[PDB]
Design a protein around this ligand. Structure first.
Ligand code: 12V
Length: 700
């Protein structure tokens, strides 16, 4: 029977559908003032408080809801989500398991339990629990879409086309019902959704930040109109949770120190605590100001701090990735706010003005897939610190064994001095001043092979320190992660990774989720046309290896055609790319950071640009490099380009030499020029704002 508080609860339910969140709270609270023992009112109020970010208070009402109704399995599940958001994964897990034990048919708890496993890398366990959730509730969009991503990570392509068809129909149905899509924005690049669908997904998720900041009830920030208080300097703020041992940091760590201190004042806002790595040290020691916002949990106070610094241009280096605090940008503490480098997609949000990209990555004809205005960098928006992090890979030498450049490679800072101690060093000349020292098969050469085959850590030849490529972490762990430059000479051989000493090696060091059935089929075609070639992949994760292999068998490839390797330390991973002949980029989602890694090794990369940002980054990197003949307009051209590289050995030599020279001469790895071009772009933005205009496209 309906009571008095029962009506108030129903009234607030309506307000929650209307979107009028704040009034729903008042009605939920008024209902609890009438009936303090109202379990449903407690659960509902807490569900709203959770949306508002008031987690501690939501947790309070969740416990009360359970004290009143001990069989409220739905209250357990929601309390877990709150605890999961409160970084108490321990307590969250307990809530889910308790819920399942009370009601084994409660599908939502099984789904939430699977999400915990998924976030913890336990993919097979996550898949198992998602299937249980779906077996209980067949119409479960959140579970289905999460399972879809789980199957993507491990390359489970069972009913792939049917699965893609349903994913789209789910997002479409949800967008037409005006509900939050079950597909995460960072995952939208993987599915055959429309451009409109993806931007809509980004928009819906952006609006989640609005709810969390509206409760603060903060007035609009008064923004600077000039550079007077800043002494004629533009104040640029870089907001990231990746200042440390993270891919983002690797690319841009040099950039803040290379800014012009006469025109710019750099502020780095860290969303993560100090991990002690050298990457964090460099940025802290080179940025004009370093602010640890990880010690400022409240978005209101954090945004206040940003505004109190007088930031003109605030930069979002996270977007929709792990550790992002987009509530900061939603509060708009800066007059100009831009997306940069970190997130390969649109934010879909009103509180984001520009997105720093380029002509190649984001051509003007597809600007309608972004919500922000386009802000073109001259060449490519992408950057890497490979010139600074791995200067020992700038020059190499090889060992002959009866001349190839990827069988037995030696790198080192004092490498040229080591070669001068050797009697019969051959100097092979590259074409388009460059050379490649070749060591003949003598006593010294055999001593090195001995170290490799035996599995020794290191040896000493003529006083020089000759190190094993597989033992970099046992000699200098700092050099292994890339925090330091190796102070010894490192030997890298194909035998170390089980690669055949006489075969064409196609490599792809990306995570396995980037591969779809059409890509493996595309690669199988290449491998079949090049009989003496192999495909080099990584166990990323390892459980994807039996899956990838299985489909390769069905396409007609013997097992020995694809060779897997474990994930290596950062330095080893970049360096061992020297062993490959050609890198086959993934068309569904390009290798972004990994793309810069293979290029620094001088390894040519074949790519096929898609329509999404993430599927066009590699091609943007290649145009900047100067290798337009490595870009394919369709699948057939992709396969053709690779097949030619694997059969025309003199053509392969010309292209490999082209990448080896233009990785230094082109502006691709030039962090100094990139910074200046970025600065030039910053000023165009500010002058546009200072003139009294609202953000518009920047095409130089
Ligand atoms: C699609 C997408 O999300 N793109 C993002 C870009 O948009 C951002 O601009 C990049 C900067 O944040 S991050 C991201 O870049 P991606 O290119 O997807 O790489 P991802 O995040 O899988 O990890 C590769 C790392 O593992 C290291 N790595 C890899 C293999 C290995 O054996 N050893 C190793 O150290 C590599 O050296 C790298 O350090």
């Amino acid at each position: 029977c309906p009571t008095h508080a029962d009506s108030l609860n129903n009234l607030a339910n309506i307000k929650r559908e209307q979107g009028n969140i704040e009034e729903a709270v008042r009605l939920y609270r008024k209902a609890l003032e009438v009936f303090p023992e109202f379990a449903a009112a407690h659960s509902n109020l807490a569900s709203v408080l959770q949306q508002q970010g008031k987690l501690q208070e939501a947790l309070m009402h969740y416990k009360e809801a359970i004290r009143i109704s001990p069989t409220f399995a739905d209250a357990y599940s929601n309390m877990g989500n709150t605890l999961k958001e409160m970084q108490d994964v321990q307590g969250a897990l307990q809530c889910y398991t308790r819920a399942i034990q009370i009601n084994p048919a409660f599908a939502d708890a099984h789904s939430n339990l699977a999400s915990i496993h998924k976030d913890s890398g336990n993919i097979p366990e996550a898949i198992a629990s998602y299937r249980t959730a779906l077996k209980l509730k067949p119409d479960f969009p959140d579970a289905y879409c999460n399972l879809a991503h789980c199957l993507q990570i491990v390359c489970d392509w069972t009913d792939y086309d049917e699965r893609m068809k349903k994913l789209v129909s789910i997002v479409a149905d949800q967008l037409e019902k005006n509900r939050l899509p079950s597909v995460h924005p960072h995952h939208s690049m993987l599915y055959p959704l429309s451009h409109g669908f993806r931007k809509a997904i980004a928009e819906r998720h952006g609006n989640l930040c609005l709810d969390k900041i509206n409760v603060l009830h903060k007035p609009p920030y008064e923004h600077p109109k000039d550079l007077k208080l800043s002494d004629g300097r533009l104040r640029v703020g870089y907001v990231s949770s990746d200042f440390g041992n993270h891919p983002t940091s690797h690319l841009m760590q040099s950039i803040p120190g290379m800014h012009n201190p006469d025109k710019f004042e750099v502020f780095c806002y860290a969303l993560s605590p100090d991990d002690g790595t050298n990457f964090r040290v460099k940025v802290m020691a080179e940025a004009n100001h370093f602010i640890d916002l990880s010690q400022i949990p409240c978005n209101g106070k954090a945004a206040d701090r940003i505004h109190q610094d007088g930031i003109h241009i605030l930069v979002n280096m996270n977007g929709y990735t792990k550790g992002a605090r987009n509530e900061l940008f939603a509060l708009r503490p800066a007059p100009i706010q831009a997306m940069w480098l970190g997130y390969p997609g649109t934010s879909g949000a009103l509180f984001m003005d520009y997105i720093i990209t380029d002509q190649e990555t984001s051509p003007a004809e597809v600007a309608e897939q972004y919500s922000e205005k386009l802000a073109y960098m001259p060449h490519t928006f992408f950057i890497g610190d490979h010139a600074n992090m791995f200067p020992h890979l700038k020059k190499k030498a090889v060992i002959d064994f009866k001349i190839y450049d990827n069988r037995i490679v030696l790198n080192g800072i004092d490498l040229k001095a080591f070669l001068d101690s050797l009697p019969d060093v051959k100097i092979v000349k590259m074409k388009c001043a460059l050379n490649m020292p070749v060591i003949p098969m003598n006593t010294i050469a055999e001593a090195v092979i001995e170290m490799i085959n035996r599995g020794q850590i290191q040896i000493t030849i003529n006083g020089f320190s000759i190190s094993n490529g597989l033992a970099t972490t046992q000699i200098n762990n700092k050099a292994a992660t890339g925090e330091e430059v190796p102070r010894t000479i490192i030997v890298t051989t194909r035998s170390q990774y089980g690669l055949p000493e006489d075969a064409i090696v196609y490599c792809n060091f990306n995570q396995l989720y980037k591969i779809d059935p059409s890509t493996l089929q595309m690669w199988a075609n290449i491998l079949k046309r090049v009989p003496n070639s192999v495909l080099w992949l990584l166990r990323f994760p390892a459980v994807g290896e039996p899956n990838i292999q299985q489909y390769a068998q069905n396409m007609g490839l013997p097992q020995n055609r694809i060779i897997f390797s474990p994930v290596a330390p950062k330095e080893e991973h970049v360096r061992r790319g020297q062993l490959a002949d050609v890198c086959l980029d993934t068309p569904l989602c390009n290798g972004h950071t990994t793309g810069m890694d293979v290029l620094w090794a001088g390894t040519p990369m074949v790519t096929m640009p898609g329509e999404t940002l993430a599927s066009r980054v590699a091609a943007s990197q290649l145009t900047c490099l100067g290798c337009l003949e490595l870009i394919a307009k369709n699948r057939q051209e992709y396969e053709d380009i690779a097949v030619k590289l694997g059969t025309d050995l003199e053509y392969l030599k010309k292209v490999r030499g082209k990448v080896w020279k233009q990785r230094i001469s082109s502006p691709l790895f030039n962090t100094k020029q990139y910074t200046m071009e970025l600065e030039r772009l910053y000023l165009q933005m500010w002058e546009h704002y200072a003139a009294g205009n609202k953000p518009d496209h920047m095409i130089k």
